[model samples]
Target chain A: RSIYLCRHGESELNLRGRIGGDSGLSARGKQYAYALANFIRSQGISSLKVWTSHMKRTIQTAEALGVPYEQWKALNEIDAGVCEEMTYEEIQEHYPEEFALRDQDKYRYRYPKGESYEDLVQRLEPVIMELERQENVLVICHQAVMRCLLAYFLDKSSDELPYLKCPLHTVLKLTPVAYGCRVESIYLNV
Target chain B: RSIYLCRHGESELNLRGRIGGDSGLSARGKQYAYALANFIRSQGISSLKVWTSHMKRTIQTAEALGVPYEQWKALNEIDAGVCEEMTYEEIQEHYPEEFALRDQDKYRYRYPKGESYEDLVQRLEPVIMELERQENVLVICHQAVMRCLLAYFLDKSSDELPYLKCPLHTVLKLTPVAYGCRVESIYLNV
Candidate 1:
């Protein structure tokens, strides 16, 4: 049994370097979506369950696969709250204290009226539980949500949770080995 | 790749037909424990993780296995509240209304100042999550706890969860096959 994780294709918000939003995929993002569809079809996996967040980008990405997928509100991206759709530079300029606190402990640092990486772990707990019950599943999620799921399988600590690399258009294939997980990062150079 | 479920060898409370209490194994119960140990050894499984609840009977049962094991508080028997350590006849005599209500809808019926089967499911949710992550595991727990775990594996509904049969000295082997689970029941006649 293995678990596959992929970030939603880049969205219009991504093009502007924004952190969080419910925007549709960009032109290039749509190209990556088709590439992902081809990649999944090539895997020859039967009974592979697909999951996505209740957002435009994640749903749009799964639509390309032409498979029935489940939607999880818990899989949505981390809430940026007051800083929603704001760039890192803009966050620093507007709320320097909050930005500095986040840098101090990004994993535990909560956004103004929003969730932290710690909060994301609690919210994603059920998804992880259901993931364990299934044999094979492809989770089309966002960067922050993917990081939390990866941390559980990879046994990453809280300090390392926020720093896990989850680049766009890349899929992480995780197979349970003897006592740990084997991760193979496949980058779809779209 | 399989999950094993077993009730702790019958406890003193079990002999007296009492609901919930921390009691040691009876003489016959201890004999069943040794029988369980031999049965597990015959399975020829490697890397088997054994788990028990934080109760005298469960701990004593695992002790007979002579192998390393873990204990979980959440796996403890269902709290009977005011009915703790009370026999069915006593409950019927003292609280006929509660007894009738339990029979009406056992799944959602919460004991006075105690938990219901629904609450037990929520408590065992994490144990199920971790069980999904592991390969082979033997959970030496109680009747109610075993029923909750079995319901999750067998996809039983709430109406059937509280009444799932889990006899003493019996072991259930659950293997994932296709989209569902295959269960094999083994009873050791002590």
Candidate 2:
């Protein structure tokens, strides 16, 4: 099966001092929509079904892909809960203990009333199952969600998953081979 | 004519210490919907039309107004362009020159590839004309946009316009008189 993964376009939230959750793309992000369309055309991946989180950012990103996409709430970013809109420094200042704990073990540390990386992995179980059965699916998701899926396919330990780099404006192609999965990064200049 | 004005509920961007054009309301924003509905009922205002900017925050805020609202592209918050999502601190650190210049003359200082208060005032001409023709209209808008509208009715100069206090969670009431406008500030506990 050929599966492609891409984070949403650079959101207003990304330009702001926040992390996690839904925010729509910037002007450059809108441009990346056309860029992604060109990239998809170059790959000859026509008529590929796309999946995204219901969040505006992911949905807006998919709009650029020039292919029909379905939004799945299950594919949303890790819920930060009470910490949803906070910056790293703000978290450090207001929830110092939680911040330290998260830094110590981000994969397992859940924010107060928020999901842990482990929780995200669990939430994504159905998605992974469906992904296993699908053909030529493109998952437009968030950074944390992407890492969880990547770790599953790459056979990486949970300890290493949280630190996985899933930068903005990039796409990952995962080809499931007989032995395992091969991953390729398609970086789009924004 | 009657109008309603307010900002979006707290956003992840707001929590993360960013400002201008990059924020969307948080989950608490959803809670504010009910509170706003209650406030509208308390006002006993009937059959009032709602208006919102094209931005997510204004649209989301208008959702709380419990009325069908039209989105106006002209009503968008002042664009910050390249500095769209940066916090005030981040702006100071990264674009100190721009920050200083903005402080020096915020009314006229145009952001790089963005807009100035002067530009915002000029662009708002159409909206002003529409406002004059509408009846009992409620404009759910941003601080900058609200300021311009308020100044137009209150006869405040451009220098005083940028400093007008338009806090979050408060609705401004404008009543048109023969020569000027009467104003009232309603602070909603939500």
Flag regions of model 2 displaced more than 4 Å.
Answer: B1-190
Tens-place lDDT digits, model 1, residues B1-190: 9899998887887666567999999998899899999999999888999999999999999999989999999999999899998755346435656876886788899879888999999999999999999999999999889989999999999987875767778899999779999999887777
Model 2, chain B only, scores a TM-score of 0.92
lDDT per residue for candidate 2 within B1-190, as digits (tens), equals: 6766666665556566666754678776556655776877787876787888888877877776557989888888889877887765346435656876776687999878889989999989999998888788778787789889999988899987876666656678889888888888776554
Error of 2 at A103 (Å): 1.4
Model 1 complex DockQ against the native: 0.01
Each model's TM-score for chain A is 0.98, 0.96
lDDT of each residue in A1-190, candidate 1, tens digit only? 7788988887887766567889999897899899999988888888799999999999999999998999999999999899998765346445656876776788988888999999999998999999977898999999899989999999999987876766677889999777789999887877
Note the Cα lDDT for every prediction shown. Answer: 0.86, 0.78
Per-residue lDDT value at B186 in model 1: 87
Q: Give the runs in model 1 whose Cα sits over 4 Å from its true position.
A: A1-190
